[PDB]
Amino acid sequence: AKTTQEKFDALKEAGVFSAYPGTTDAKLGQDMTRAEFAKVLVKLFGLKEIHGQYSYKDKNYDAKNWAAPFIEAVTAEGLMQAKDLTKKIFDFNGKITVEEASKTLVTALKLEPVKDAQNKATDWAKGYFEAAVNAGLFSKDANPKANATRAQLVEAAFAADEMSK
Numbered sequence: 001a002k003t004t005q006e007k008f009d010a011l012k013e014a015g016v017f018s019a020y021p022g023t024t025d026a027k028l029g030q031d032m033t034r035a036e037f038a039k040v041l042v043k044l045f046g047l048k049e050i051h052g053q054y055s056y057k058d059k060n061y062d063a064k065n066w067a068a069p070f071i072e073a074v075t076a077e078g079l080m081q082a083k084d085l086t087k088k089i090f091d092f093n094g095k096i097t098v099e100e101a102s103k104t105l106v107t108a109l110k111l112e113p114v115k116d117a118q119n120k121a122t123d124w125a126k127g128y129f130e131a132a133v134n135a136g137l138f139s140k141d142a143n144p145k146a147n148a149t150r151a152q153l154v155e156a157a158f159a160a161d162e163m164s165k
């Protein structure tokens with residue numbers, strides 16, 4: 001029964017997770033940007049990076065943005081999309097929430113969103129969050145609307161990896 005730090009070390013060695021930006025620390029208590037999480041999904045599921053394509057109009061989303069190839073890949077794969085379909089805003093510096101992470105992993109693992117889902121999640125996410133809890137990606141006491149901790153994202157990513165591996 002591996003600890004969270006053991007799960008992080010294994011995923012870091014595998015090139016799926018990085019230390020907290022600018023540090024060599026796991027910082028399991030810290031949050032993660034949607035940009036960083038897009039890279040985790042690409043590494044976790046071996047997606048192809050997409051260079052020279054930009055599907056969003058976020059300020060400073062362009063060829064100089066390191067995350068664009070990863071964000072484009074998870075967009076093409078149908079794992080993530082804009083928060084705003086009119087302004088085409090991905091919110092790449094926004095922190096990934098537990099219910100957002102749930103949608104990406106449930107979609108990636110082809111798990112069915114739960115019918116008659118009843119939980120704390122935003123309306124759009126209730127089925128995704130429920131499926132994620134039922135598959136053991138997040139604990140029953142996770143707040144779906146909360147920013148996911150790197151600890152929660154390690155636990156979810158390790159569980160997803162084993163469910164495919």
Ligand SMILES: CO[C@@H]1O[C@H](CO)[C@@H](O[C@@H]2O[C@@H]3CO[C@](C)(C(=O)O)O[C@H]3[C@H](O)[C@@H]2NC(C)=O)[C@H](O)[C@H]1NC(C)=O
Nearest residue numbers: 034079080081082083084085091099100101103104124
């Ligand atoms: C009115 O508030 C908006 O409500 C939207 C749904 O009706 C909500 O949109 C969701 O955004 C989520 C962001 O995370 C993921 C995992 C993603 O695809 O990246 O899932 C997205 C949902 O599918 C949904 N997006 C849309 C276009 O409907 C916005 O987050 C939310 N915007 C903000 C700024 O919080």
